[PDB]
Design a protein around this ligand. Structure first.
Ligand SMILES: [Zn+2]
Lengths: 158, 52, 345, 158, 97
């Protein structure tokens, strides 16, 4: 692969000059570095509950009265999903529900006067961002911006 | 006033576990039931020591 | 902790670390951007692959793996197989042609180091277009949507500077977003450039008369086809939806919305009328010769109300025939048994 | 509107539980329009704030991260969370579930050092390196004598 | 508004009084028919006129609004039965297409 993503013995990137057969190769392999809920999603989809539980059962009943108080407070929550609950992937969002229309009406008032729950405005916000997202990624992709937008988005989502 | 007060004492802390971990504090009778099905119906008594 | 600064900072962090030479390096990257498309355009030839393909696949080989191709736009193309496969053919191209693969790649890479060196070039510009109705960020975001759109188009051969060239497109992109996202009820660009005039003319008239212009002063002032009904009509629209939820009366708890009634839903007395109407018309439906009744019945009744293509087979004169007669017989057998008289409506 | 269609392709109870082709509209009066919901397929995910800003940060507990200060760092920003594999070292090896910063992350992936010593005048430095550049390895801190002690403070090649 | 008189607000304390009383139904009356049940009052009005015991209360919108309101937040609120099996409040109108 040239002037970019290239998997060698244990070196990362690879630049290329055709003047002299000079093929520089910086050395940092695929260092999975991410952020945003993208990072946390993976992590949430890989936590083997049963493990973590038996991890703290042993982490609880043995160490001193210190790090075992943290493990208890950290187990009840795990036991929560673990019991008849529903696994912890769900805490993330890749599909934001949308409140019905008539609950957040769009009314007509005194002449041009129109009424509408603020909610509609927060949604639009969210939509336009999420939409600028993809459309941004598509058209090439300078990093700073992709996050800036993902950041802004992250705000809108809440 | 008793009716109400009794509600003020309808919770007890845990010490000796079996199903769920110790320091929890739950309804008083939600233990007169369990402790009731861990010593008589299904033996192998799991004495759940609680705290008013 | 509060956004804005981070980005304004994150920019300056790679900006303050990666500024670009006023000419040279910009002219350098440029040549490497144009020689990029040009290159790809030849790849497509020598490969019968659509430019859209090369452009993407080359981008991933640089920007991001199979990760960024999955979540963004679904698995239409094989995140694994399809991409490497294409690259396989590119690398398999003889020296004479592979030449361009490296150029393409070296091309898109340059684009990368040309879009960032100006992210602040945008910010500055955005600094102006502000309070119109978009967060400072968005205003900057939509400005970058313009920065790139300005790279795809710059011709370095035409000696005039880049920075400038970017200005134009950037403002272009910011405005659109402004005209298009600014309000809750979409209004056209047309009836936008027009509202501003009116907002403006409203002031020129505030200037001399003193009396807040009647829809006449404003109309005369504006222009040609401007009546009095027009301006009055232009404004109700130039208004802003009032929050369905806002303090009403002796404002405390009583929330606005609860003062607005309903209409779709029939209130009990009406829900009871459809009851009586239905059954009574339906009882007075049977005392008829279905041969024509059930045609007008369902007509207004079932589908929609056209006398011509009205009946199945028989011609028209037999429509009105039993129609006008059945209808009437139907009108007088009810005059007797007065059921509908006191209009259920 | 009531049983009526979007464009009036249908208009009665008879055609109750059935749909239209041209516009598409099952139907029973407006009432449904308030009970129905819809979504917004997001580009990159974002988590339910409720779960992130509640004392027991459910995603900060179940995940042993700064229960409220680590997320705040990765979430609404660009401060990486080393996902799986992370070959190369930063003094130590891979940091399984630890974090890094823009300065280090960028000092890692895109290799290590990228300096930009650009010379003064036109006939100066153009004779201190040109000869010791193209394929000529240059040690750290090598001196570039002509104008201003140009000092390349990082390894390998030029 | 202009003609019809506005309803009376059934205060919490008013709720307790009734709650305190064995006035079981009477309280559900106020929570649905006389206010929050669209299907109800409707069914209710007519029921009378003809001459029958009112139609057992549907559900209050106040609740239905909570589910969708709550649902706007990635939190799912689904009611249940004897066995932990679904039960549909928004009567079928939420079964996609
Ligand atoms: Zn239609």
């Amino acid at each position: 692969a040239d002037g970019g993503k290239v998997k060698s013995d244990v070196y990362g990137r690879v630049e290329v000059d055709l003047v002299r057969n000079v093929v520089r190769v910086v050395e940092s392999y695929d260092i999975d570095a991410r952020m945003g809920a993208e990072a946390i999603q993976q992590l949430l989809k890989e936590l083997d509950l049963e493990a973590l539980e038996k991890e703290l059962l042993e982490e609880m009943k043995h160490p001193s009265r210190a790090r075992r108080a943290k493990a208890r407070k950290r187990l009840e929550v795990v036991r929560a999903f673990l019991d008849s609950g529903n696994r912890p992937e769900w805490m993330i969002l890749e599909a934001v529900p949308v409140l019905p229309p008539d609950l957040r009406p769009m009314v007509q008032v005194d002449g041009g006067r129109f009424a509408t729950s603020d909610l509609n405005d927060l949604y639009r916000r969210l939509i336009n961002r999420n939409n600028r997202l993809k459309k941004l990624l598509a058209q090439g992709a300078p990093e700073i911006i992709i996050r800036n937008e993902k950041r802004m988005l992250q705000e809108a989502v809440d | 006033i008793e009716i109400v007060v009794r509600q003020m004492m309808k919770y007890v802390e845990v010490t000796d576990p079996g199903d769920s971990r110790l320091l929890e504090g739950q309804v008083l009778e939600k233990w007169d039931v369990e402790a009731l099905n861990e010593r008589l119906i299904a033996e192998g008594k799991t004495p759940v020591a609680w705290k008013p | 902790k509060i956004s804005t600064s981070d980005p304004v900072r994150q920019y300056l962090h790679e900006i303050g670390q990666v500024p670009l030479l006023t000419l040279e390096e910009e002219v350098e990257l440029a040549r490497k951007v144009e020689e990029g498309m040009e290159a790809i355009k030849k790849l497509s030839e020598i490969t019968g692959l659509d430019p859209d393909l090369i452009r993407e696949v080359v981008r991933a080989k640089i920007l991001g793996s199979a990760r960024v191709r999955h979540i963004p736009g679904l698995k239409e193309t094989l995140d694994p197989k399809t991409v490497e496969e294409i690259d396989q053919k590119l690398k398999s191209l003889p020296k004479e042609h592979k030449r361009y693969l490296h150029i393409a790649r070296e091309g898109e890479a340059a684009r990368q180091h040309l879009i960032e060196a100006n992210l602040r070039l945008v910010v500055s510009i955005a600094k102006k277009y502000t309070g119109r109705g978009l967060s400072f960020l968005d205003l900057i975001q939509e400005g970058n949507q313009g920065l790139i759109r300005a790279v795809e188009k710059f011709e370095y051969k035409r000696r005039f500077k880049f920075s400038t060239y970017a200005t134009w497109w950037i403002r272009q992109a910011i405005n659109r977003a402004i005209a298009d996202q600014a309000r809750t009820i979409r209004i056209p660009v047309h009836m936008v450039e027009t509202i501003n005039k009116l907002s403006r003319t409203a002031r020129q008239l505030q200037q001399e008369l003193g009396r807040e212009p009647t829809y006449e002063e404003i109309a005369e002032a504006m222009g040609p086809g401007w009546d009095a009904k027009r301006v009055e009509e232009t404004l109700k629209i130039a208004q802003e939806p009032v929050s369905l939820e806002t303090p009403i009366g002796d404002e405390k708890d009583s929330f606005y919305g609860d003062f607005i009634p309903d209409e779709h839903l029939p209130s009990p007395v009406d829900a009871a009328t459809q009851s009586l109407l239905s059954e009574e018309l339906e009882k007075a439906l049977s005392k008829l010769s279905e041969r024509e009744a059930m045609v007008l019945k369902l007509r207004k009744g079932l589908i929609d109300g056209e006398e011509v293509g009205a009946f199945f087979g028989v011609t028209r004169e037999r429509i009105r025939q039993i129609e006008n007669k059945a209808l009437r017989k139907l009108k007088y057998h009810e005059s007797r048994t007065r059921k509908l008289r006191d209009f259920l409506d | 509107k009531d049983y009526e269609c979007a464009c009036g392709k249908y208009k009665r109870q008879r055609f109750e539980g059935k749909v239209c082709e041209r516009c598409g509209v099952e139907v029973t009066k407006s009432i449904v329009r308030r009970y129905r919901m819809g979504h917004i397929e997001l580009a990159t995910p974002a988590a339910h704030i409720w779960f992130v800003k509640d004392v027991p940060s459910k995603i900060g507990t179940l995940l042993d991260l700064s229960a409220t200060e680590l997320e705040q760092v990765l979430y609404f920003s660009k401060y990486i969370v080393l996902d799986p594999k992370g070959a190369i070292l930063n003094g130590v090896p891979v940091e399984k579930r630890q974090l890094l910063t823009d300065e280090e992350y960028r000092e890692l992936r895109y290799g290590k050092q990228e300096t930009y010593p650009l010379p003064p005048g036109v006939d100066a430095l153009v004779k201190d390196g040109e000869e010791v550049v193209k394929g000529q390895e240059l040690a750290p801190g090598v001196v570039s004598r002509l104008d201003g002690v140009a000092l390349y403070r990082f390894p390998r090649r030029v | 508004g202009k003609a019809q008189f506005g309803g009376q607000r059934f205060g919490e304390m008013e709720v307790w009084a009734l709650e305190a009383y064995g006035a079981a139904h009477t309280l559900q009356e106020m929570l649905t028919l006389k206010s929050d049940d669209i299907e109800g009052r409707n069914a209710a009005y007519e029921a009378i006129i003809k001459g029958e015991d009112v139609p057992e209360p549907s559900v209050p919108e106040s609740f239905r609004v909570l589910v969708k309101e709550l649902q706007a937040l990635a939190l799912d609120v689904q009611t249940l039965d004897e066995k932990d099996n679904p039960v549909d409040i928004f009567e079928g109108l939420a079964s996609k297409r």
